Amino acid sequence: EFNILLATDSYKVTHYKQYPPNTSKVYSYFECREKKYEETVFYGLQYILNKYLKGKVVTKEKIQEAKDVYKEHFQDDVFNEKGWNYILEKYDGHLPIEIKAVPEGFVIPRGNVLFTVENTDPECYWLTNWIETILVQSWYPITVATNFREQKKILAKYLLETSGNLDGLEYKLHDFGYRGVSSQETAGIGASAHLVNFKGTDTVAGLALIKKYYGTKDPVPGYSVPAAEHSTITAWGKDHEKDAFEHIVTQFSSVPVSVVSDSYDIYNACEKIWGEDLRHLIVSRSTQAPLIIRPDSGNPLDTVLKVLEILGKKFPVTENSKGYKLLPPYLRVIQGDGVDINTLQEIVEGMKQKMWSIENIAFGSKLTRDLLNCSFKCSYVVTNGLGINVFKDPVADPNKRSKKGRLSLHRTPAGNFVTLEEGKGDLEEYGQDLLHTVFKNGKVTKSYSFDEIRKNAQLNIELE
Amino acid sequence: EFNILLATDSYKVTHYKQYPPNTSKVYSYFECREKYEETVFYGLQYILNKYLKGKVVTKEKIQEAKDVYKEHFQDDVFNEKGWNYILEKYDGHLPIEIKAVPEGFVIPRGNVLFTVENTDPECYWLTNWIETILVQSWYPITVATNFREQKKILAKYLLETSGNLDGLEYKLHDFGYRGVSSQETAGIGASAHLVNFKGTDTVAGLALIKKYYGTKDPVPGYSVPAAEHSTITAWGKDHEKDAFEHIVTQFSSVPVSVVSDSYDIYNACEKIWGEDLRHLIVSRSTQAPLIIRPDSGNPLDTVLKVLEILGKKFPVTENSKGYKLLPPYLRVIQGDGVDINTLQEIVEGMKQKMWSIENIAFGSGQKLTRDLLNCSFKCSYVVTNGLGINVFKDPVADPNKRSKKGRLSLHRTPAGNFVTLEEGKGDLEEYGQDLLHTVFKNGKVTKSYSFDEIRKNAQLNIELE
Ligand SMILES: O=C(NCc1ccc(S(=O)(=O)c2cc(F)cc(F)c2)cc1)c1ccc2nccn2c1
Ligand SMILES: O=C(NCc1ccc(S(=O)(=O)c2cc(F)cc(F)c2)cc1)c1ccc2nccn2c1
């Protein structure tokens, strides 16, 4: 079972002894520090609060466990047993902490306060930064949500240009990343952040996370359809790729189905197998049950263009109202090899240059904490009853300078966001603080449904 | 609770309908595909124990999956019968056999590392159902490998500048807890780092190792007290010296690291440590050094400038190799921007400036991906209508993605290297014993390794010498 006393950087175990004597408050904040990616989607704190921070997170057994582990880990007695026992005894193991945050799904420019943390009991001055490590992992859902939103902007631009509308945009970037992430827990979190932006996923772990921690009106937040993998083709033997294809499309004759076609020769598969031998099985399919051909190797742009060129000569192509070529409704393509934000752009731009509609294609999808510079810093403390504004400001890197004092987030006269420092929010010159109390003394005090998060994270173009 | 029926890529739910009819066996393998020439095999045992072993199928889990997939696919495609069979016939234990190279083994790219096959003909579909969960072993493999390569660099330069490898296992400390994607990842990643080193701040790694692997020592990893920017800055911008003095006095008898770049790293080293507080430093024991931590600026330039500063404020000696060495009560740690490329740049830069690597330690925490070592799971053999056939992919535009054929086995070559035999050629017995061992069979873990054996297996040659 998870033990919050063992869920911090080791050195933080020793910090309670290092603050100035008589420190009663430590107040810290999280921002995506300013230096592409000018605005970030704030998403994922709610998961952390509920799974790890709320309720009785301290017990006698957990304190004894940490005591024993840290004795061996430090080869010495340094663990703050008394501090944790106090929280156990005084607050029945609930954390005397208050956290204020921007609403989940909000799109905010870099360099703004996203959330703040402070102790609500003077005895627990040391607790604010103990939980830095766990709260900072919010960088991941934030960065995933942000990066996927940036990809969606690109797809929307090109789909709108080549087709005149945004029909199907939310199914244009399917999550294929389950096997490529570092753990089961990460798969769930990352998939949930993808699903803020899209509705097609193969990462099943995302559905349960969303249902447990966020909630949707619909039974599930994400969908998929049947498809082959290389093993269901290659198992038939090298000479029987056609038999494989025929069997699979016949098994899934009235639902969409995607079939990886590059096991031996993508160009032959498209031109001769799909385009000639099995063509009669494809042109007979319903608009609701297209075959989606999947190339999966070679240069992604070159291969997509060649595949379209091949299919365009074997199948009846139309020209839509914007003048772009469109495959018949029972035939589409999906490319999931090598697709990052850069190549996605390259492919849609290249399709556009060859007069191919983005209607024809869908895509299948490492980010670090450094990408958006997600950082947690102490900005205000109270020692001997006097408040002081604190910050780092390293001489050799002005970009690492942190914010000073009590912080608040505000709407500007032009309707933008601004972060006020040094408690200046209290001057009431910028109206109300936009942060909301989301956690206080062991309880989640404000939360958001996945439907509302999705709404908050919409593109302007979707808002029309 | 975790549900194996919900722990696969969605499309794999539909594959049981796609294999050739009359298929009784699907046999698949994992390799770090050739295109980091040797990889540390580590982490499978965790997955086996946490997710695959025991009664992993129940009536409730089958129903939960049926319900989820009905909505997810908007269709009934889930193989309820197949899972029911496992529940009824095997008390919910997976009829799968997994054979793997021992954990810790250091194996060249392009070799079979583990194989998976169904042990019951009805469960031909199950082999690849669990590809997704097993392929996540790419992560501890790649972390263990990447840290081993950083250890090789440190070893080379420590040996060259000092004449020995003393303290090598504490030269790269794990700082990465906050920078990973999740709590679970933190434990897995820390455990892979600990295959190579002993200093860690990622506590999660210790519990994982104790639960899934085990060590003779009480814990596999260690740390010492240290400040963070907050415990310095909280004193106020005018009181950095007061913060330093308080902290080193609180930890007067144990090693302590103190981040010194809050305002001006060069002033802090030359004037605060080097003059105002020097008397509190030179009095420290060799078992309790102060470890100064810069944390900004160009990593190489900042490290050299910090050493140059300290070298003029403190008594430097020259070791038998001709390199400069700070007095034993004073050391440096660089934990900002340290990846494998910059680690190399720093130690080489230090060597050029005649500074021993004894003076410095590093902290870790671009990302490693599954593409780095090309970790991949592929079907190589099936039995259909009672006939074994060797299967594989071989995409025309990318020979690098060609996969291996048939039943596989891993062997020592006559010169002591490794070779993977394809097409069941291992059966000829021309290359001695298959090095893959059965680690999982029919819901039971059949062979396990302690963390101690793994560390021994993953040792560097320079350590062996
Ligand atoms: O094919 C796979 N999954 C199935 C799939 C099929 C089509 C589409 S689509 O976007 O064309 C589509 C989406 C949808 F929800 C409704 C549709 F009608 C059309 C998306 C997803 C697949 C492939 C490689 C892979 N690697 C790891 C996991 N992986 C899964
Ligand atoms: O200072 C930190 N942890 C403490 C620390 C102190 C010294 C050494 S050392 O390698 O000098 C050392 C190791 C050891 F085990 C025995 C020693 F005597 C000497 C390593 C680690 C720290 C700093 C930044 C950070 N970000 C996230 C987590 N973080 C932790």
What is the SS3 string spanning chain A?
CCCHHHCCEHHHHHHHHCCCCCEEEEEEEEEECCCCCCEEECCCHHHHHHHHHCCCCCCHHHHHHHHHHHHHHCCCCCCCHHHHHHHHHHHCCCCCEEEEECCCCCEEECCCEEEEEEECCHHHCCHHHHCHHHHHCCHHHHHHHHHHHHHHHHHHHHHHHHHCCCCCHHHCEEECCHHHCCCHHHHHHHHHHHHCCCCEECECHHHHHHHHHCCCCCCCCCECCCECCHHHHHCCCHHHHHHHHHHHHHHCCCCCEEEECCCCCHHHHHHHHHHHHCHHHHCCCCCCCCEEEECCCCCHHHHHHHHHHHHHHHCCCEECCCCCEECCCCEEEEECCCCCHHHHHHHHHHHHHCCECHHHEEEECCCCCCCCCEEEEEEEEEECCEEEECCCCCCCCHHHCCCCCCCEEEECCCCCEEEECCCHHHHCCCCCCCCEEEEECCEECCCCCHHHHHHHCCCCCCCC
Token pair in block for residue B23? 């298929």
Residue A393, phi-psi category: left (phi > 0), alpha (psi -120 to 50), beta (remainder)? beta
CA distance B435 to B99: 9
The torsion angles phi and psi of A165, rounded to 5 degrees, stand at: -150, 180
> Which residue is closest in CA terms to ligand 2's atom 25?
B175
Do B244 and B207 fall into the same domain? yes
Cβ atoms A169, A152 nearer than 8 A: yes
Do A149 and A12 fall into the same domain? no
CA distances from A82 to A25, A73, A85, A177 (A): 18, 19, 5, 44
Q: Is the CB of A174 under 6 A from ligand 1?
A: yes
**Which residues are bridge partners to A40 per DSSP?**
A108
Cβ atoms A146, A37 nearer than 8 A: yes
Count of structural domains within chain B: 2
Q: Which domain holds residue A397?
A: 1-136+369-447
CA distance B261 to A398: 12
Do B160 and B194 fall into the same domain? yes
Of how many residues is chain A composed?
Answer: 464
Do A360 and A401 fall into the same domain? no
**Residue A331 CB neighbour total at 10 angstroms:** 21
CATH of the domain at B348: 3.20.20.70
> Which residue is closest in CA terms to ligand 2's atom 23?
B175
Of how many residues is chain B composed?
Answer: 465
Do A220 and A242 fall into the same domain? yes
Pocket mutation for ligand 2, best pick of A9, A130, A139 (most atoms within 8 Å of C-beta)? A9
Distance from CA of A389 to the nearest CA of B (A): 8
- Which residues of chain B lie closer than 8 angstroms to A191, CB-CB? none
Place of tokens 């509308």: A165
Do A158 and A276 fall into the same domain? yes
The torsion angles phi and psi of A349, rounded to 5 degrees, stand at: -65, -40
Place of tokens 């309707």: A415
**Partner-chain residue, chosen from B12, B233, B398, that has the shortest CB–CB distance to A378:** B233
Do A228 and A374 fall into the same domain? no
Chain-centre distance of CA B269, in angstroms? Answer: 35
Cβ atoms A168, A190 nearer than 8 A: no
**Which residues are bridge partners to A444 per DSSP?**
A439
**CA nearest to A143 within chain B:** B181
Token pair in block for residue B376? 């991949």
Q: Do A183 and B179 touch (CB under 8 A)?
A: no
Token pair in block for residue A408? 């608040």
**Partner-chain residue, chosen from B206, B297, B395, that has the shortest CB–CB distance to A396:** B297
Do B128 and B143 fall into the same domain? no
CA distance A238 to A227: 19
The torsion angles phi and psi of A373, rounded to 5 degrees, stand at: 50, 55
* Beta strand segments in B202-328, E: 256-259, 290-293, 317-318, 324-325
CA distance A379 to A26: 8
Cβ atoms A180, B370 nearer than 8 A: yes
Distance (angstroms) between ligand 2 centre and the Cα of B163 equals: 24
Do A378 and A455 fall into the same domain? no
Q: Do B233 and A183 touch (CB under 8 A)?
A: no
Residue type, B82: G
Q: Do A74 and B231 touch (CB under 8 A)?
A: no
Of A39, A16, A347, A181, nearest in space to B367 by CA: A181
CA distance B253 to B248: 9
CA distance B449 to B103: 7
Cβ atoms A244, A278 nearer than 8 A: no
Q: Which helix (H) or strand (E) holds B115?
A: strand B112-118
Cβ atoms B309, B335 nearer than 8 A: no
> Which residue is closest in CA terms to ligand 2's atom 5?
B224
Q: Please work out, in degrees rounded to the nearest 5, the angle formed at the alpha carbon of residue A406 by the alpha carbons of B230 and A12.
A: 20
Backbone breaks in chain A after residues (C–N over 2.5 Å): 35, 365
Place of tokens 């605005």: A39
Cβ atoms B103, B457 nearer than 8 A: yes
Residue type, B140: P
Its sign, for the CA torsion B220, B231, B186, A336, is negative
Pocket mutation for ligand 1, best pick of B8, B9, B71 (most atoms within 8 Å of C-beta)? B9
CA distance A351 to B189: 40
Cβ atoms A318, A334 nearer than 8 A: no
Pairing state between β B256-259 and B290-293: parallel
Rg (chain B; Cα; Å): 27
Q: Is the CB of B291 under 6 A from ligand 2?
A: yes
Of A376, A402, A442, A388, nearest in space to A117 by CA: A376
Experimental method: X-ray
Distance from CA of B233 to the nearest CA of A (A): 6
Q: In what order do the strands lie in the sheet with A291-294?
A: A173-174, A361-364, A331-335, A291-294, A257-260
Token pair in block for residue A327? 């495959």
Distance from CA of A328 to the nearest CA of B (A): 23
Pairing state between β A374-383 and A386-389: antiparallel
DSSP classification of residue B50? I
CA distance B103 to B96: 20
Cβ atoms B49, B138 nearer than 8 A: no
CA distance A29 to A33: 11
> Which residue is closest in CA terms to ligand 1's atom 29?
A176
The burial class, CB within 10 Å (0-12 / 13-18 / 19+), for B332 is buried
Token pair in block for residue B365? 């925490």
Of B331, B322, B318, B321, nearest in space to B358 by CA: B331
Place of tokens 């696969």: B8
Cβ atoms A191, A209 nearer than 8 A: yes
Q: A342 CB contacts (<8 Å, ≥6 apart)? A: none
CA dihedral B348, B354, B358, B361 (to 10 degrees): -40
Q: Please work out, in degrees rounded to the nearest 5, the angle formed at the alpha carbon of residue B269 by the alpha carbons of B267 and B270.
A: 65
**Which residues are bridge partners to B27 per DSSP?**
B117, B381
The burial class, CB within 10 Å (0-12 / 13-18 / 19+), for A264 is middle
**Residue B452 CB neighbour total at 10 angstroms:** 15
Q: Is B61 helix (H, G, I), strand (E, B) or coil?
A: helix
Interface probe for B, chosen from A1, A9, A192, A379 (most Cβ of B below 10 Å), is A9
A35-58: string of b/e by CB count within 10 Å (b at 16+)?
eeeebbbbbbbbbbbbbbbbeebb
The torsion angles phi and psi of A257, rounded to 5 degrees, stand at: -150, 140
Cβ atoms B2, B184 nearer than 8 A: no
Chain-centre distance of CA A399, in angstroms? Answer: 25
Do A294 and A389 fall into the same domain? no
Place of tokens 């007061």: B242
Do A208 and A90 fall into the same domain? no
DSSP state letters, B255-279: -EEEE--SS-HHHIIIIIIIIISHH
Of B376, B389, B378, nearest in space to B24 by CA: B389
The burial class, CB within 10 Å (0-12 / 13-18 / 19+), for A315 is middle
**Which residues are bridge partners to B259 per DSSP?**
B293
Interface probe for A, chosen from B23, B28, B203 (most Cβ of A below 10 Å), is B203
Cβ atoms A397, A65 nearer than 8 A: no
Do B105 and B233 fall into the same domain? no
Distance from CA of B419 to the nearest CA of A (A): 24
